Structures are given as C-alpha cells and as structure tokens.
Amino acid sequence: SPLIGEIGPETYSDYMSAGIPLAYIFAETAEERKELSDKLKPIAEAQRGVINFGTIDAKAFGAHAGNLNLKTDKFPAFAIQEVAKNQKFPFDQEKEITFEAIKAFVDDFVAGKIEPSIKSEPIPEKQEGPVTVVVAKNYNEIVLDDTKDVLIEFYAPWCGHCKALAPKYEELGALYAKSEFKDRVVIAKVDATANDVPDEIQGFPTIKLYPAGAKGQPVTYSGSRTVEDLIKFIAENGKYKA
C-alpha cells in the first residue's frame, strides 16, 4: 500500500489495531488531500514504524474531526491520535498546514512535548452578560472555586426545554449580579455537548449547585424550574444561604 494511505471504514480498524499513533489529514476534495499528502510525505517517511499518516475525506467523514478534538467545519486540518492511551493531539486549525509547521508539531509529539487535548470551546476573553459561561478549560476555576456557591446549568444547544429555560436563567443571573450576594454566588451555564465536563449528565438541561466548601457534594435541582424556586434552591442549599 501507499505510504500515506486512506483512512476510512475498511482501513480504520487496521489503523487502530496497528498499535502506533495515527495522523489524520483532513480535506474536502481529492485534489487537496493529494497536495497535502505530497506536502507531508517526507515526514511520514521519517516516521515509518513510529507514526502512521493517512488522508481522510472531510466531506464524507468531517464528523470524525470532533473525535480528535478538532472543530467540526474548519478544514483542512491535522491531528494525531494516540490509540493505546486514547489521547488526542490536534494542530491549531487557524494555522496553515505546511511541511515546516507539521514537522515541528510531529517532532514535538514524538518528543512527548505536547499535552493531550480536551474538548473545550475557547475560554471567553470577556465574561460579560450576567450568566458566566463555563467551558471545559475554566470549569475547575469557576465551578470548583471553593469560596463561591456555584449554580451551573448543563445544556445542549439542540434541546428544547433548555432554550425554553434560557430567558429565566438569564433573569436569575441578572438578579444575583445586582444583589448584595454578587461577590459569593455564581450563576453559570455550560454547553455540555461542546465541552468535556466532570459531571455525568443524563438529560438536558441539568442544574447543579456546587456550594462553597462542599464541592464534593454538589446538589441536583429537581424543582419547578421557576426563577423563585431556583433562588429558594440556592439559599436553602448554599453555604451562604443567599
């Protein structure tokens, strides 16, 4: 077979089972797949036996990008999968894919210089709006902040009751941002479909209170989902009985 093969249904399990890492090159047309194949060939050459490289059809399989912690719908892209440890190593998708760039990345991977990825939207540069936006990369900082009573909503964009709940959650945040409790209570949400989080979720929405000092016994709301019942909830279960 060709040095840089063709990652798809027939070849995948062979790729997985080979027991070495796999490097995906994502692209929407055959024409671009080739360009890049050739562009990267000398690196694949170097890494024989140590890393498999392959081309993947981003039209037919773009969805698989998310499995590598690459953004859906931003091609062409590149990422390396450590099969054994089940670790993902995406290559920034805003950066251009060039021999010199990839080679550095790869060398750094092989060097064990890169930290394994995580599903996260990027940390927002500003936290404006009354509801704090949690993404995977600040869940700890914000949700597990031991000094704050944290209310967190776990949502899915595509869920109906979540969108129904949205305005009232917004209202509940604006209310606490304007109260005497502003410094110690947090009203936050996270898109659980876009971010890896700790909590095991079963349906959307889900609301939990992580109280200050008891971030091991978070509390699952199962009330009416009205602004006042959720205030009652934070007061009744929060350290600061707000």
Side-chain angles (χ1 to χ4, degrees), residues 13-203:
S13 63
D14 291 316
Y15 273 125
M16 291 300 98
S17 314
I20 57 165
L22 176 59
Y24 296 71
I25 291 156
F26 281 84
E28 285 157 279
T29 61
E31 313 218 331
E32 186 160 32
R33 272 171 246 141
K34 195 196 294 186
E35 287 167 9
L36 291 167
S37 297
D38 295 313
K39 280 175 70 93
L40 297 184
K41 187 163 164 139
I43 304 154
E45 186 64 60
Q47 301 304 333
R48 281 216 242 233
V50 39
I51 298 173
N52 291 317
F53 281 64
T55 242
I56 185 163
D57 186 340
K59 199 172 285 158
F61 308 128
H64 195 69
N67 291 150
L68 300 164
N69 297 344
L70 289 164
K71 311 219 80 189
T72 355
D73 300 286
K74 185 74 226 284
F75 301 119
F78 183 91
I80 290 169
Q81 192 187 338
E82 164 76 51
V83 164
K85 307 200 74 182
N86 183 49
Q87 288 181 336
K88 326 297 159 67
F89 300 83
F91 169 82
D92 189 329
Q93 293 166 264
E94 283 100 337
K95 299 294 211 177
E96 183 184 11
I97 294 170
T98 61
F99 171 96
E100 208 203 24
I102 295 311
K103 165 173 165 49
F105 182 72
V106 171
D107 281 303
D108 288 348
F109 168 69
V110 174
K113 283 225 289 267
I114 314 175
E115 57 207 67
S117 86
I118 214 160
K119 259 220 268 177
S120 191
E121 299 161 297
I123 296 179
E125 69 284 69
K126 1 71 50 52
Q127 58 239 257
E128 256 173 10
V131 182
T132 288
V133 177
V134 166
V135 299
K137 288 168 163 208
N138 65 15
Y139 171 101
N140 282 330
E141 184 202 306
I142 293 165
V143 182
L144 301 172
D145 183 346
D146 218 11
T147 70
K148 313 277 182 305
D149 270 355
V150 187
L151 189 79
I152 179 69
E153 178 195 19
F154 299 93
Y155 74 99
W158 54 256
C159 142
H161 306 80
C162 310
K163 163 115 107 62
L165 174 63
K168 300 176 286 163
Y169 199 81
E170 186 70 13
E171 182 173 1
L172 173 81
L175 195 71
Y176 272 79
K178 295 162 57 53
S179 91
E180 69 262 56
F181 308 106
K182 186 242 166 144
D183 24 4
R184 75 200 73 145
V185 171
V186 181
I187 303 307
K189 61 177 187 195
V190 55
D191 187 352
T193 82
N195 290 271
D196 277 336
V197 303
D199 308 68
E200 276 287 51
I201 306 298
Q202 298 202 327

